[PDB]
Amino acid sequence: ILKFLFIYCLVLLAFANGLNQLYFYYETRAIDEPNNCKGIRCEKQNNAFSTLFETLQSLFWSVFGLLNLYVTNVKARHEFTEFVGATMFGTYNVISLVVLLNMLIAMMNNSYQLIADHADIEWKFARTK
Amino acid sequence: DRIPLQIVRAETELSAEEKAFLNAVEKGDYATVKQALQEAEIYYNINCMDPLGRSALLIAIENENLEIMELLLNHSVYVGDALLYAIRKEVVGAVELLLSFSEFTPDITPIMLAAHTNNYEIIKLLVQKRVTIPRPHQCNCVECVSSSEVDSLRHSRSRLNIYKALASPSLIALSSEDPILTAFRLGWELKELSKVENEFKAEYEELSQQCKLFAKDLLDQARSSRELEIILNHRDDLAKLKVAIKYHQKEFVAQPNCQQLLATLWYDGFPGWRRKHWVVKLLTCMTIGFLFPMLSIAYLISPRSNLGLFIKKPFIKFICHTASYLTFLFMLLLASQHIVRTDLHVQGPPPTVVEWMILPWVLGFIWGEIKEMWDGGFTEYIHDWWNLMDFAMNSLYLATISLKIVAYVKYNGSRPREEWEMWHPTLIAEALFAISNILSSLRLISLFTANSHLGPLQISLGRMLLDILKFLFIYCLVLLAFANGLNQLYFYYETRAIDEPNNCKGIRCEKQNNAFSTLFETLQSLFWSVFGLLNLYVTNVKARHEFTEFVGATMFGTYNVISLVVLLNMLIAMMNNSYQLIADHADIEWKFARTKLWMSYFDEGGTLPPPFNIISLIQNQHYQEVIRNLVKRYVAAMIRNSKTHEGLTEENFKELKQDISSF
Amino acid sequence: LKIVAYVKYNGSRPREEWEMWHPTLIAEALFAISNILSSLRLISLFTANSHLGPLQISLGRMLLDILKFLFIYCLVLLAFANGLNQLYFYYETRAIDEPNNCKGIRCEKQNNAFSTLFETLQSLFWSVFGLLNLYVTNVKARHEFTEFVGATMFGTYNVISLVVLLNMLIAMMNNSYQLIADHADIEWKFARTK
Amino acid sequence: SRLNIYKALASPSLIALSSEDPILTAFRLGWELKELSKVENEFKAEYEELSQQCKLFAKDLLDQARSSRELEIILNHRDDLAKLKVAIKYHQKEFVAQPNCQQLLATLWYDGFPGWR
Amino acid sequence: NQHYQEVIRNLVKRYVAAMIRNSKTHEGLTEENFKELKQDISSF
Amino acid sequence: ARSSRELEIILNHRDDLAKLKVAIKYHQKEFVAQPNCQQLLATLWYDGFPGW
Amino acid sequence: LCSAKNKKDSLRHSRFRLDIYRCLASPALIMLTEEDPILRAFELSADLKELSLVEVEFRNDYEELARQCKMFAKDLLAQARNSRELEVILNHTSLSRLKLAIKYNQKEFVSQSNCQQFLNTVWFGQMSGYRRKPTCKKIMTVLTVGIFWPVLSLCYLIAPKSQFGRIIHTPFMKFIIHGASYFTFLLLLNLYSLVYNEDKKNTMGPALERIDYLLILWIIGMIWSDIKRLWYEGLEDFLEESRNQLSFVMNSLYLATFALKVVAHNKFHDFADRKDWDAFHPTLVAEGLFAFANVLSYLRLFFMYTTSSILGPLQISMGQMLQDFGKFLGMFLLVLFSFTIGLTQLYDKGGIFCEQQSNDTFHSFIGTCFALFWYIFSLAHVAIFVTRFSYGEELQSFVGAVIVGTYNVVVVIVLTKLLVAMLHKSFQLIANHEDKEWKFARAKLWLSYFDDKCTLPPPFNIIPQKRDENYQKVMCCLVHRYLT
Numbered sequence A: 001i002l003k004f005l006f007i008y009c010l011v012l013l014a015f016a017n018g019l020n021q022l023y024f025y026y027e028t029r030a031i032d033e034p035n036n037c038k039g040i041r042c043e044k045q046n047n048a049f050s051t052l053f054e055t056l057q058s059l060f061w062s063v064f065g066l067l068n069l070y071v072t073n074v075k076a077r078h079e080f081t082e083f084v085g086a087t088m089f090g091t092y093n094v095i096s097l098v099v100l101l102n103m104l105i106a107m108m109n110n111s112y113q114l115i116a117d118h119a120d121i122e123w124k125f126a127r128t129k
Numbered sequence B: 001d002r003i004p005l006q007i008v009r010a011e012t013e014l015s016a017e018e019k020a021f022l023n024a025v026e027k028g029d030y031a032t033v034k035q036a037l038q039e040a041e042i043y044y045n046i047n048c049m050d051p052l053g054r055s056a057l058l059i060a061i062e063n064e065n066l067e068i069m070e071l072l073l074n075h076s077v078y079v080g081d082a083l084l085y086a087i088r089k090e091v092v093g094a095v096e097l098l099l100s101f102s103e104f105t106p107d108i109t110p111i112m113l114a115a116h117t118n119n120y121e122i123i124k125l126l127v128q129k130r131v132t133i134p135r136p137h138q139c140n141c142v143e144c145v146s147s148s149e150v151d152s153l154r155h156s157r158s159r160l161n162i163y164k165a166l167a168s169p170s171l172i173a174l175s176s177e178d179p180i181l182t183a184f185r186l187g188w189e190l191k192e193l194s195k196v197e198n199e200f201k202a203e204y205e206e207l208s209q210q211c212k213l214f215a216k217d218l219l220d221q222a223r224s225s226r227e228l229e230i231i232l233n234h235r236d237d238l239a240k241l242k243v244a245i246k247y248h249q250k251e252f253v254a255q256p257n258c259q260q261l262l263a264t265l266w267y268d269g270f271p272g273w274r275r276k277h278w279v280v281k282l283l284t285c286m287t288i289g290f291l292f293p294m295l296s297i298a299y300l301i302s303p304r305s306n307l308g309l310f311i312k313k314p315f316i317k318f319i320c321h322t323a324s325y326l327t328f329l330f331m332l333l334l335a336s337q338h339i340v341r342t343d344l345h346v347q348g349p350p351p352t353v354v355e356w357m358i359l360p361w362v363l364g365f366i367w368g369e370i371k372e373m374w375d376g377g378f379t380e381y382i383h384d385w386w387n388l389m390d391f392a393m394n395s396l397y398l399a400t401i402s403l404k405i406v407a408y409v410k411y412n413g414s415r416p417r418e419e420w421e422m423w424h425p426t427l428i429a430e431a432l433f434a435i436s437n438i439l440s441s442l443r444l445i446s447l448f449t450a451n452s453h454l455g456p457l458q459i460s461l462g463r464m465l466l467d468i469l470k471f472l473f474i475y476c477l478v479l480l481a482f483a484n485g486l487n488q489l490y491f492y493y494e495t496r497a498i499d500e501p502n503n504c505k506g507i508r509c510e511k512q513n514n515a516f517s518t519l520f521e522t523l524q525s526l527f528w529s530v531f532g533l534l535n536l537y538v539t540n541v542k543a544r545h546e547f548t549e550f551v552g553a554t555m556f557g558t559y560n561v562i563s564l565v566v567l568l569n570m571l572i573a574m575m576n577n578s579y580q581l582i583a584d585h586a587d588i589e590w591k592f593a594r595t596k597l598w599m600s601y602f603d604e605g606g607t608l609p610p611p612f613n614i615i616s617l618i619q620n621q622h623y624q625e626v627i628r629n630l631v632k633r634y635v636a637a638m639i640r641n642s643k644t645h646e647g648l649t650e651e652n653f654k655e656l657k658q659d660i661s662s663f
Numbered sequence C: 001l002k003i004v005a006y007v008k009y010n011g012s013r014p015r016e017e018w019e020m021w022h023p024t025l026i027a028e029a030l031f032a033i034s035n036i037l038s039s040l041r042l043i044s045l046f047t048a049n050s051h052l053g054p055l056q057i058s059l060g061r062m063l064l065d066i067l068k069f070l071f072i073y074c075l076v077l078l079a080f081a082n083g084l085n086q087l088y089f090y091y092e093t094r095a096i097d098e099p100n101n102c103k104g105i106r107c108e109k110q111n112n113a114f115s116t117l118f119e120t121l122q123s124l125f126w127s128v129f130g131l132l133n134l135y136v137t138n139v140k141a142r143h144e145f146t147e148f149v150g151a152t153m154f155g156t157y158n159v160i161s162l163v164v165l166l167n168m169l170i171a172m173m174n175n176s177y178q179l180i181a182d183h184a185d186i187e188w189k190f191a192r193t194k
Numbered sequence D: 001s002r003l004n005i006y007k008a009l010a011s012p013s014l015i016a017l018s019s020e021d022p023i024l025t026a027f028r029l030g031w032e033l034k035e036l037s038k039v040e041n042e043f044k045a046e047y048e049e050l051s052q053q054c055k056l057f058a059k060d061l062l063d064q065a066r067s068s069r070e071l072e073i074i075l076n077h078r079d080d081l082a083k084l085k086v087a088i089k090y091h092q093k094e095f096v097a098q099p100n101c102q103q104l105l106a107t108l109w110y111d112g113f114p115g116w117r
Numbered sequence E: 001n002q003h004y005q006e007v008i009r010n011l012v013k014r015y016v017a018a019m020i021r022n023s024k025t026h027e028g029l030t031e032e033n034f035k036e037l038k039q040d041i042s043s044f
Numbered sequence F: 001a002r003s004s005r006e007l008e009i010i011l012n013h014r015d016d017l018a019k020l021k022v023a024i025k026y027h028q029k030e031f032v033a034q035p036n037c038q039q040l041l042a043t044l045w046y047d048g049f050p051g052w
Numbered sequence G: 001l002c003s004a005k006n007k008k009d010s011l012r013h014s015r016f017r018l019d020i021y022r023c024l025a026s027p028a029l030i031m032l033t034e035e036d037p038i039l040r041a042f043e044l045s046a047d048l049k050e051l052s053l054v055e056v057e058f059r060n061d062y063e064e065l066a067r068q069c070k071m072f073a074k075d076l077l078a079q080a081r082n083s084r085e086l087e088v089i090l091n092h093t094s095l096s097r098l099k100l101a102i103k104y105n106q107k108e109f110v111s112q113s114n115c116q117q118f119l120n121t122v123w124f125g126q127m128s129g130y131r132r133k134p135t136c137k138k139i140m141t142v143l144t145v146g147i148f149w150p151v152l153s154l155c156y157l158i159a160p161k162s163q164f165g166r167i168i169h170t171p172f173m174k175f176i177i178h179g180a181s182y183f184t185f186l187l188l189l190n191l192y193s194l195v196y197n198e199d200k201k202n203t204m205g206p207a208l209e210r211i212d213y214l215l216i217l218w219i220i221g222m223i224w225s226d227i228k229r230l231w232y233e234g235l236e237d238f239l240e241e242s243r244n245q246l247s248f249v250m251n252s253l254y255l256a257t258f259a260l261k262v263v264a265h266n267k268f269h270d271f272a273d274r275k276d277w278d279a280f281h282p283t284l285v286a287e288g289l290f291a292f293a294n295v296l297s298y299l300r301l302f303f304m305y306t307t308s309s310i311l312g313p314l315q316i317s318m319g320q321m322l323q324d325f326g327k328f329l330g331m332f333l334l335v336l337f338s339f340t341i342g343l344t345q346l347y348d349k350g351g352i353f354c355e356q357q358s359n360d361t362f363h364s365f366i367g368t369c370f371a372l373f374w375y376i377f378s379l380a381h382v383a384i385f386v387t388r389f390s391y392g393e394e395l396q397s398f399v400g401a402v403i404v405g406t407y408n409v410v411v412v413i414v415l416t417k418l419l420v421a422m423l424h425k426s427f428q429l430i431a432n433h434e435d436k437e438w439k440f441a442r443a444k445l446w447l448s449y450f451d452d453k454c455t456l457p458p459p460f461n462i463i464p465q466k467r468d469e470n471y472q473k474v475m476c477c478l479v480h481r482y483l484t
Ligand SMILES: CCCCCCCC/C=C/CCCCCCCC(=O)OC[C@H](CO)OC(=O)CCCCCCCCCCCCCCC
Pocket: A011, A083, A086, A087, A088, A090, A091, A094, A095, A098, A099, B468, B475, B523, B524, B527, B530, B568
């Protein structure tokens, strides 16, 4: 599992770098937002890809579908930039959820079958320890 | 109420005297057969055959009795195809006796059958008589064309029989000057054939696997390092290893002794690297990376010095290149900090400090890529997937630079960023730079093959990407179908951006609107529903037509069911099946890939990291003496493993009891 | 239907004033369904290719077990839908009493999700994909026992549907594909010969 | 008794000796034995095994052609590729998927394009 | 029909011989060994 | 082993169950999980609880 | 005395006992020494299975001896040649032999072709022509019998010996009549809300309608059959079947809602709107129990899938994979309790069912458990904004978000994938015995309809030396055939 988390961390770092490079020109201030809340832990999510730390947090929570889709919009309404950002987010979603999770499922299936043939002996060794 | 049973195709029955002669032949009574043949000569049948077709000579061969066979041959009995029947049983004595309806196709010769049976003694016995085998054509020649039209079945059978005869390990060992090179070329050619002849794929793949196994097993007989170096360095520098790599001989490359020689070459200047604590290795790797600029500069200032020669070792080359790439990536990560860039409202910006530092790395990457491509050629560049990624990344960087130059010259003044148009050169340049950063940071995965824990897993994951495209085609077809339907249904109720709140139109707004109003938007909406990011209220319409809304909702639900309950689980099952098959050969593939990576640093053509780069008869005699020893040991081995039968010993003990009774 | 609509109606009218069963709307819906069905026929051309053929055949042979699973899921869904509709049918509210004149769960504020059996079946269908909000179990009268029972039943349905059946189906589909994969070549060649 | 009779009638040697058209007899017997397995649920395995044996006998009998003329004679026999159509009608997948029959079908299908491969 | 019966005759003959090969050779060789050994010696 | 006395002699030999501890130190999992050793260990473990 | 020996040498004592039992379970010894080899194999096989449980260390050896005993009795039955011998063997008393095999869990014995052929004849009875009918003709026969079930059940009541009276006596039609009787009970429940007067929704003491009396008659009928089955068989045999357990709970829930309904009509009869009643008013409690019992009524139809030969094997396979789900419940239950402790410690010092979900879900132990429960699906039921403190606590808000993120990875990514890994492994082992397990379950279900103790459907039920010598002759033939 850690062996897979290494690859996932590499992919996440790459996509976070790209998204933060694209979206950092439009950072706003906390006082300019309703309720004076800045970030993705607010009632209306904003500034999702403004800083590298916030980009990492946003990409982590999108694995469980907890990041909304309007965070890719910008106030200036530059359609090319928003389309490119949405495409980056979609590519990350496809790679992370359609590919890596299923490969993890397959590898866990294979490893368990080999481990299962000796479960009793290892359990009894642990129990006598 | 009954089914009558009667012979439909009747064959003439033998006479009583012929049946008695047959029984005497089978019983092995030489006197009775001699008397019967003498009576036959007096009356003026040995040529008679059974309804099964087993003649007296064939039964005599089948019973392995040399005396009756010798006596029958003395009386001018018909021979026919007795040699083939003797060869197929693999009895030497009958074969030498013979040399001194049918069960076989008319295109089979004794040498072909001997090669098929893979019997060293019989093949050797036949070769001394100067036999020949036709060479198969590579073909639009008139002879091949006419043969194919006249009878395709015979032509294909004959071709398969010839290739089966040629690919016999014993024949290759006995009659080839260079058995290893012959095995390599025959394996490659046989592998190419299975793609052309789709019907007979399995036999050709089996023959290719047999050739590969023979080539691998020949190398296992080396007993000293001198023999191994002679074999691997023979040129028709490690020429033999490069030839084996060219022909995709994974098992030959992944042999333990070949790997040991490569490991010795790789860890040049590091004695007992394996005998070190993991901490010491980690500290050693860190310091060399920190000192990488000093080592590169020393080589440029003075190659002859010790520091100049330090970079020549392949492991140091690898460490320095990795450190340089890591530094480039870290500098890329630092270009998005708002501390470096002060103003954002300048139409044409001159490059900042970070971009000035970055540019030499990009120039070095481009120069190295074009140099590699020019040296290797187009095919070898196209062969590796990673080189394609490099080409895309470098093209994107070049486009970024070209767009940055135009904006600076064209625009002088400063404007608010919200006033710019959509197709502004600065925005396009920034987007291209971001995509380039994404592509660059993903290249680090190609360095996983050098590790023993993360290498085989990377190889297995990379081998599972072929089926995903196959499934993606079907998914794209289904998506296009449902998008067509939904856009056909929902395109009558398109609203304007002014009517919507906040003045936002699309499914990328806090309140999703116009989800299925256009084909492009329909495709985007159906893509995002896979991850659950499309809300259910987008199927409603302002006019409140219940039938239309219900039809659209049912379309959406059917698409959701098909996409998420059927196809996803199907993909999971397919990728599970593929992983189990791949896992059984992961070690050999990983060793092949790591060997390919290692030999890329043995050459001295490219030494500097990217930022610094821009600134024979006697040999044949020794090879033949080693090859002779390997073949001699190989033959004595395969006989002991499989050519050893308890049943053959049984009749020998019966013969010993016969000899004891005679004594 | 298009000919009937052409003959019958001979005047222009605002589209929002048309009734629910106007012939033009039915014709358009049937045309859209026909387009969906027509576009899906291209899968039958995959058997002519040596790469996409065996995969198409194997996917075809795997559709028999999914229906057997769906029958059992249908039984479970019917049971839970009957229970929820029996519990929640007293608190049915009219469309006038709701904001924007909504009734049902196709609205921004989902409501009356368990008031009828048909709507209950639709609501339970959409919970598999997570498109039903958790506040639909609330009661305007604010009765604690009823809301507790409804939430417990909804949670039990979600657990049974998404934690047990889906994983069972995954394992079953894994086993079936491995057996099918062995004979893919012969079946694909038979299909291509046909 | 019925099972014993059907098992006796499905012997490859008996079919070879006593049948006028062994291939058609094998096809019909395999189909009939496959249909009997559903009605007689108690003996499903035996009837399935007998049907498989009949199919294998027919395929192995086809496997012994030594020329294209013999293959054409076998495939074109009518009691136009009539035998192939009869095999398709009876779900003889292994018989149809034989490499020589597939090669003949390919040379029929790719007419006008020599050396397409 | 005459041509078809000719071809069927050849195929059946080849099929019978092939299946006999797997059943008969080992058994025949084993039987001929011991039986020949136990009667000729007695006659001698 | 055919008797309990032989099993005790083998398991208690010291160059307290010293042999068992030595086997545990060397990760002899198949040796330790033998049914007779497990029976003896269970007898030692459930002392004061007959027929547990 | 045996305890004294075990103190001196327990390894020798255990080995001697296993040596004796391996001698007793010899197929050759049973045939030569026992009068009833089939019954001896049944009793010994059940004896050796129990010994495996007590002798945990000798588990493998004992269950190998039990398997050997089971395979011997199945091979003895395979030597029967005609139906006369089959009826003699399966009807002997020491269908007593057929019922004895079901009690002793002889799955191999039941799945034999001779045993399966015998079951089919008894199950269909005089309607053996049903098997000759085509598929299109079979369905019309089942639908006709099911639709006219009240008439056929009534005909047996007045003229049991008539032609229509004896129709129920055959097991196959009895199963259909009982099945159609239950399908009408479920139809009455569906129609209960449709015929509900809207004026009664604001009535606090509503009286029992005519439809309510119909449901009471069925419930007594279903209950009455339940004591009869329990009384004739026993507690342990009756409690073992899952279908019987589901009938226990749903019958108590149906009595509670009607007991509360009568009391409410006699105590609380006020006319007031629904919005003004107490939360725990008896009328509201009565409707909560009624809805719960409707779910358990529809879930009883799972046993009817066993008869089908298409959905039968699949349903049995899913039943055996439910045992692996219980083990994962124990580990997940501790993980959910661990994160509940820390999360309520951090936020209480400073719910999810509202349209705007707030931080108040973490202010109680019950609320915290519910919020973590809805995170398992990964369908975004709960938002991240819930973790943020209402007034400030910038640092404590971040720590709470990290705690929730760790919970998601542990459960949704690690525990869920581990659960799928074992279902892949266990199913492959189960798939091997799919046919043998389904046939044993179907024969167990069929045998319950052979007894004439319960013949009428539930609404109608409430209304008021010679053979031993033959067995020995067959036994010697079967024994001597087996040796040959
Ligand atoms: C470790 C590395 C592993 C890499 C594995 C790669 C496997 C193959 C995946 C490739 C990624 C594809 C990226 C492009 C598509 C995603 C981006 C996107 O749509 O942008 C949306 C953006 C913004 O809405 O829109 C578009 O780009 C245009 C609309 C595209 C709609 C059709 C998409 C076709 C592909 C669908 C793939 C679905 C896969 C799951 C199926 C269950």
